[PDB]
Design a binder for this molecule. Sequence first.
Ligand code: HEM
Ligand code: HEM
Ligand code: HEM
Ligand code: HEM
Lengths: 145, 145, 139, 139
Amino acid sequence: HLTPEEKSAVTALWGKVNVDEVGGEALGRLLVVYPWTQRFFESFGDLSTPDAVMGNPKVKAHGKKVLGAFSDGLAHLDNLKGTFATLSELHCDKLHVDPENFRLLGNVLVCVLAHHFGKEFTPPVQAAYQKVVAGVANALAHKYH
Amino acid sequence: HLTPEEKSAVTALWGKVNVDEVGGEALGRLLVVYPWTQRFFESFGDLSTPDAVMGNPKVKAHGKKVLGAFSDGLAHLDNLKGTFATLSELHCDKLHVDPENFRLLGNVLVCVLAHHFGKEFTPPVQAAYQKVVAGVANALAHKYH
Amino acid sequence: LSPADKTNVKAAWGKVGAHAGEYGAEALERMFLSFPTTKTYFPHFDLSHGSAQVKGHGKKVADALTNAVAHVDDMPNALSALSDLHAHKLRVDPVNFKLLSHCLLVTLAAHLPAEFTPAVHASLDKFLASVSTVLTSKY
Amino acid sequence: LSPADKTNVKAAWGKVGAHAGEYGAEALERMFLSFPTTKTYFPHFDLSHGSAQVKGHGKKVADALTNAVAHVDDMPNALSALSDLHAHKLRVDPVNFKLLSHCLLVTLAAHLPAEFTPAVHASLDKFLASVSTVLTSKY
Ligand code: HEM
Ligand code: HEM
Ligand code: HEM
Ligand code: HEM
């Protein structure tokens, strides 16, 4: 539930997001900080070192796809449940990803946005983005509900 | 999502549940095992010792009310979200209870049912009741979603 | 973990006695039935009711828990190899440890009605929580 | 944790330097804005933007974190009174500790872009997690 000011701020900040690096950075940071999530990406090659994780082309491409999904969810903020129905099916009935990792990834993305934008990532902007990522995780975890 | 056999088993076991003691037992065990939940019941008197908690008439009466709510939810398994709308309002917007505590209380209730029924509380019965309490907690936490 | 918690856990696990392997198998069966997402960690296992593989795994888990009860003051040193196995080769999600702890508590409550007082319940909850943190301490 | 984790955390908190109180106040403000349920814990507080009470509380939290960094090998003994306060008197739900840890990490990332490498991020996350477990070990 975003106010018009929150929606405008989120859209404005997302307009400046590099769509080729931010998603891969967030996915790599998730893999480094929560190493049990590496279980789901054993076909991605070497993930033993954080340098190896952040240097993985497979991780970069998958992060690009995840960032594209996040952008699609941001484009439809009032239909998150219907936007992420297929992805929820894929993540739950095929991958068995515990939905706590969805919120972990959302928080890692918030940290990445803070690290990229610095002072521009004000506490109100962060609160709006926390609302956004919580909604995205809830929509993605619908199959278990 | 309970199968007809799961629904029949849950109803049969609930038929033999003491509606005057089980809810108080579950609430007192929640207060003893997770003592940060005592912060919501500071008007209930002495809660310092397990014996004081399990001997509290206020705890017993409140547990009776919670057991009645659980019975109402069990009689309406296909409308849990609409059954617990008012209680979700009360718990979230008025009391600010974290939704994790709802699942904690559901698991404590499962433990109490196991303790009361022994070998009759079979693993299939437990799985059906786990589905029930997960649905109840989800319905109660809807206001935060 | 207080000395009262240690006494309570030692007494409860002593009354568990020689039924520990059967109790662990029952707890694993309960975990598989209640949380079927936990079965993905045992792809080569036969997880049907009465399975000898589940019986043996439950015996192993129960024996590890008995060793932990014997070494409450030295659990991190007693469970070092197990922590290494779970956190690194297995990559087990830490929520599954809560699930298994709950199923173990349910098995204990269903098999020892007299012993499962609220204080013993709290002590066992804390003991299984500490075991879970030791097994996930390598993250 | 690890020796490399300790080195990373010490370097990051040294780079925080004399901005620790301001950073802690900013983290508390972020927690209040992103998670309004945290505000219930501070009812007699003025939690508006630029509040001197929030400034002082952030200074206190930052000084406690600096002491924890200085005593990374003796955190349970360094944080005993704080754990007693938070678990017995305040009875803070342990999820809010995760919330405050995330807000602290966000403040650090927003203020130290060069220092917030993935390895430093992992080290800081581990350090704040250990602080939270020490503060929640007295229920
Ligand atoms: C939290 C927000 C998340 C979003 C928006 C997201 C999005 C996506 C997208 C777009 C795909 C590609 C699907 C396709 O190519 O058909 C995907 C697949 C996948 N995701 Fe996620 N993801 C999220 C979280 C996670 C997490 C936390 C994990 C693991 C811990 C995970 C594990 C996977 C795996 C293993 C795949 C490959 C499965 C496949 O492509 O068939 N995801 N996700
Ligand atoms: C998980 C399932 C739960 C159910 C079915 C349930 C049910 C109820 C019911 C029936 C009431 C009485 C409302 C009234 O009298 O108008 C109530 C009130 C209350 N509940 Fe819960 N409850 C649950 C969980 C919790 C938990 C986990 C906590 C705290 C950690 C909690 C804290 C309270 C408090 C403080 C009240 C008093 C508010 C009032 O009476 O107006 N509840 N709940
Ligand atoms: C109190 C908690 C636990 C205890 C005491 C425990 C104990 C053990 C023991 C003793 C072994 C055998 C190690 C060996 O033979 O060297 C083992 C293996 C294993 N454990 Fe656990 N465990 C626990 C929790 C879990 C959980 C929650 C899961 C997954 C949901 C899990 C999954 C596994 C797997 C997959 C194996 C490998 C067994 C095989 O492949 O044959 N464990 N555990
Ligand atoms: C890294 C985590 C934390 C640290 C280092 C920390 C540190 C502190 C310190 C140093 C004090 C003052 C103690 C004194 O003056 O003797 C304090 C008090 C307090 N803390 Fe925390 N804290 C943390 C987490 C939390 C969280 C998550 C909450 C609630 C969401 C919280 C709520 C409070 C409250 C209500 C007080 C009482 C202050 C007052 O009433 O004036 N703390 N904390």
